[PDB]
Amino acid sequence: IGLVGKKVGMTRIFTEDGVSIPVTVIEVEANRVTQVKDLANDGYRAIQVTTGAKKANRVTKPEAGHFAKAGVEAGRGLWEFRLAEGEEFTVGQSISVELFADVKKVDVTGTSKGKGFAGTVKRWNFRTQDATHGNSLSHRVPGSIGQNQTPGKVFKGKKMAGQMGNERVTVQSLDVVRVDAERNLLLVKGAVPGATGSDLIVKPAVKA
Amino acid sequence: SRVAKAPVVVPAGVDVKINGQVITIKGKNGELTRTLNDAVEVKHADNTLTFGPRDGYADGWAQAGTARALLNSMVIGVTEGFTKKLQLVGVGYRAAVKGNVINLSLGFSHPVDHQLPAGITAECPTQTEIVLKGADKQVIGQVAADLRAYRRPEPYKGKGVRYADEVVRTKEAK
Amino acid sequence: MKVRASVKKLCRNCKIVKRDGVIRVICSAEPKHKQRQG
Amino acid sequence: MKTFTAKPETVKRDWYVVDATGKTLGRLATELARRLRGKHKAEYTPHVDTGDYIIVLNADKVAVTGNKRTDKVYYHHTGHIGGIKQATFEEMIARRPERVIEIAVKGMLPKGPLGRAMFRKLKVYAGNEHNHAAQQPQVLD
RNA sequence: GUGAAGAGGGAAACAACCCAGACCGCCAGCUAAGGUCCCAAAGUCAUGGUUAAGUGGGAAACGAUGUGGGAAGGCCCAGAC
RNA sequence: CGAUGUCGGCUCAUCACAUCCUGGGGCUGAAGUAGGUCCCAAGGGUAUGGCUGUUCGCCAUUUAAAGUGGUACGCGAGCUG
RNA sequence: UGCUGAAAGCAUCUAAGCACGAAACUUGCCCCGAGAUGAGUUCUCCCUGACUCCUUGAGAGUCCUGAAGGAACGUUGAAGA
Numbered sequence A: 001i002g003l004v005g006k007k008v009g010m011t012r013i014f015t016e017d018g019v020s021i022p023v024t025v026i027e028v029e030a031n032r033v034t035q036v037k038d039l040a041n042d043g044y045r046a047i048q049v050t051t052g053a054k055k056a057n058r059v060t061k062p063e064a065g066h067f068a069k070a071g072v073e074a075g076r077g078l079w080e081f082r083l084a085e086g087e088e089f090t091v092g093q094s095i096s097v098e099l100f101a102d103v104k105k106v107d108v109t110g111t112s113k114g115k116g117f118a119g120t121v122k123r124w125n126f127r128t129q130d131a132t133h134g135n136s137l138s139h140r141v142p143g144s145i146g147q148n149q150t151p152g153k154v155f156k157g158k159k160m161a162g163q164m165g166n167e168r169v170t171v172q173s174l175d176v177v178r179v180d181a182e183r184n185l186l187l188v189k190g191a192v193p194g195a196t197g198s199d200l201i202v203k204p205a206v207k208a
Numbered sequence B: 001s002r003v004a005k006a007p008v009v010v011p012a013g014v015d016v017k018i019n020g021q022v023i024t025i026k027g028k029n030g031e032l033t034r035t036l037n038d039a040v041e042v043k044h045a046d047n048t049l050t051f052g053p054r055d056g057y058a059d060g061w062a063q064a065g066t067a068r069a070l071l072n073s074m075v076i077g078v079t080e081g082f083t084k085k086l087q088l089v090g091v092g093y094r095a096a097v098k099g100n101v102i103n104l105s106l107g108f109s110h111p112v113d114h115q116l117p118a119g120i121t122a123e124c125p126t127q128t129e130i131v132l133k134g135a136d137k138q139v140i141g142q143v144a145a146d147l148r149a150y151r152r153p154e155p156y157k158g159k160g161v162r163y164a165d166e167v168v169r170t171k172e173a174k
Numbered sequence C: 001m002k003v004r005a006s007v008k009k010l011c012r013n014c015k016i017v018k019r020d021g022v023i024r025v026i027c028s029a030e031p032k033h034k035q036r037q038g
Numbered sequence D: 001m002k003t004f005t006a007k008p009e010t011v012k013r014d015w016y017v018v019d020a021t022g023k024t025l026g027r028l029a030t031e032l033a034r035r036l037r038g039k040h041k042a043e044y045t046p047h048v049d050t051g052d053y054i055i056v057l058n059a060d061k062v063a064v065t066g067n068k069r070t071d072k073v074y075y076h077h078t079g080h081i082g083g084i085k086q087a088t089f090e091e092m093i094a095r096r097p098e099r100v101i102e103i104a105v106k107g108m109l110p111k112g113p114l115g116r117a118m119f120r121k122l123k124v125y126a127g128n129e130h131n132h133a134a135q136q137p138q139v140l141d
Numbered sequence E: 001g002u003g004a005a006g007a008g009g010g011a012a013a014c015a016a017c018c019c020a021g022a023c024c025g026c027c028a029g030c031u032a033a034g035g036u037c038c039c040a041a042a043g044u045c046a047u048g049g050u051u052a053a054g055u056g057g058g059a060a061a062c063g064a065u066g067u068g069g070g071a072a073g074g075c076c077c078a079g080a081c
Numbered sequence F: 001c002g003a004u005g006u007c008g009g010c011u012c013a014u015c016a017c018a019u020c021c022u023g024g025g026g027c028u029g030a031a032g033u034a035g036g037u038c039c040c041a042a043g044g045g046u047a048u049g050g051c052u053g054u055u056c057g058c059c060a061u062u063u064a065a066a067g068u069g070g071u072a073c074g075c076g077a078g079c080u081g
Numbered sequence G: 001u002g003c004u005g006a007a008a009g010c011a012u013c014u015a016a017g018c019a020c021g022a023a024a025c026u027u028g029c030c031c032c033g034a035g036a037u038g039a040g041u042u043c044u045c046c047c048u049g050a051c052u053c054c055u056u057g058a059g060a061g062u063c064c065u066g067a068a069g070g071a072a073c074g075u076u077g078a079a080g081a
């Protein structure tokens, strides 16, 4: 199905033969199933999960009730995952990281690091204009943004300046190195989105 | 016009049933069904059949004379059965039938398997010749043409999958 | 095949056909004579 | 004296059901657009939505003459740089069978707020079943 | 001839094309061009045919058992294609 | 004409298909390798340098390819001059 | 590219019917996305007191009550003009 997990930086694993492989450390505490959405009620089969811990006061009655229906502790945040037809889960069921002990490649999905208002040079990899050779007040600017009296306008989906990052992105088919059961870890190869402490929807790789 | 104006015989032990326009013919080899064109009309004349073109429609004769030629083949099929005789001309070519799945070796990197839709009796008298029998000319002729499509005759040595009766032009190398 | 706008019979065995609106020619003997359109 | 203009509050509307199985799209969608507008009623006014509510059901079973099952294209722009999406009458029926009747009516209705108001009247369905038994909608032909 | 110096209806929009010359009023009727399934006023009007190409709703030389019409001559019961 | 800044370069593009590459095909004076021409195909991709203000061109060396055009011979309230 | 097949006692990929067939097309992959006014769904949470006036009206006020929640303010952030 999939598990929610907090990102805990990057390290590396020196494999016994020689190779040093860079790994992201994802702590994946027991994902507790709160709500089993079904075709009968909702019109689609899925499960709603949570993890971590809130304080018994920062949480609001609307959600403090919502958990009491299920009979679990109030985990920080809530996420929803799709079932695969043959699968079936129960309310108030913990999901450990042992799902990924079988599978090899995984997709990690998290919110990227916010860069704020980025220019076209940074955001869209626009080439910078000549730093000298007569140039006046236009080094890192975007140049032209259209044609002339024909369209008489700027087309939609034009690559201009604006917000960069702080957006949900998926990095696909990362190889799992180790799946630790004792400390509830998951060691995926390479780098995944979002800074240390950001949440990550980890799930089995779709591209089989 | 001429083909349509010629009654179709029905041998003994060949049960024909007319469900409106849907014709179901049951014989010894296998039961067969045929949904026919709306412009054609068909009835039983004692033993033989009759194919009348319906009044009101433009191309009745054309559509009836088709159905005549269909049921002519379909009645022959269920009683007698149809056959096609393929040969694999060329060195290093091989054919086999394990059950109802034709395993070919036509000089490729991988052996190709070919499935047989419906009751198509695929035989193998020799290892480089595929005889195959059944009821429908349609499906037989199709399957044969698929088995051909993997390798059409090279117009030089005649290398490939060919029919028995099919003459081929082998042009000279220049 | 040839897609000329004025297709026509080049030998005895050649024959004219109308497949999907388009006028074509097909031959028993020479594949060269096979032509389309017009 | 003046002529009687219709007054919304007093407009006693009616509900209808239309089985669209084996109907010609245009010939249907016209007869809908006549009713939706309210020109069949004798107290018709060109600035008031007098026309009735119609429930068209079995939208996917609608018929079209000639080769328009394949050849009838439905072009629509995306408001984007060069995105001109198209779809054949098959492909439209496979995807969204409601859209077919809805467009053919929407084209025939007038443009403007009243035009959009008298489209809201129309209710299109793919299946034979509908969930408006509370209104007792009469069978229209 | 029209516009310029002439409004109005039609030709989607369109000075000069078609119809027709605005004294003012009227919640009267009859007509012109053009129209009459819906946008949008009026024929899903009647009679007998043509087209299947979305032709209608841009176009040529030229191409073709596409299809609908009359008129003559070629061959049969010694039985033709 | 009570001003619509004209070549070329840079930046940024976008569309067309009369396709340069890649993809799918027929015929070949197609043995195979590689081609030749024609048909379908616009998803993506489509040099760096030397000379000259150049566009272009020639040359050198690459490339799977170094497409032809439209866009005020795209783009000066974006830069250069 | 084919497979059966009349009109045309044959032949033909097609006129009925049936099968393959490309980076194009529609999905699959990823992102925004119910202002999708057609404003969708599921789950949970929160509120159950009197009274005259009267063009007795989705009427208006008088006191009594103000929850869920939210805002603000503060400390601030790998969030951010």
Ligand SMILES: [Mg+2]
Residues within 6 Å of the ligand: A113, A114, A115, A116, G079
């Ligand atoms: Mg930031």
Ligand SMILES: [Mg+2]
Residues within 6 Å of the ligand: A127, A128
């Ligand atoms: Mg640069």
Ligand SMILES: [Mg+2]
Residues within 6 Å of the ligand: none
């Ligand atoms: Mg200066």
Ligand SMILES: [Mg+2]
Residues within 6 Å of the ligand: A135, A136, A137
């Ligand atoms: Mg400077």
Ligand SMILES: [Mg+2]
Residues within 6 Å of the ligand: A137, A138
């Ligand atoms: Mg500036």
Ligand SMILES: [Mg+2]
Residues within 6 Å of the ligand: A136, A137, A138
């Ligand atoms: Mg500036």
Ligand SMILES: [Mg+2]
Residues within 6 Å of the ligand: C020
């Ligand atoms: Mg075809």
Ligand SMILES: [Mg+2]
Residues within 6 Å of the ligand: D106, D107, D109, D110, D111
């Ligand atoms: Mg409109």
Ligand SMILES: [Mg+2]
Residues within 6 Å of the ligand: none
């Ligand atoms: Mg003057």
Ligand SMILES: [Mg+2]
Residues within 6 Å of the ligand: E009
């Ligand atoms: Mg008028």
Ligand SMILES: [Mg+2]
Residues within 6 Å of the ligand: none
């Ligand atoms: Mg007008």
Ligand SMILES: [Mg+2]
Residues within 6 Å of the ligand: E014
């Ligand atoms: Mg003019």
Ligand SMILES: [Mg+2]
Residues within 6 Å of the ligand: E017
């Ligand atoms: Mg004139």
Ligand SMILES: [Mg+2]
Residues within 6 Å of the ligand: E018
């Ligand atoms: Mg006239």
Ligand SMILES: [Mg+2]
Residues within 6 Å of the ligand: none
């Ligand atoms: Mg009109």
Ligand SMILES: [Mg+2]
Residues within 6 Å of the ligand: none
């Ligand atoms: Mg209007």
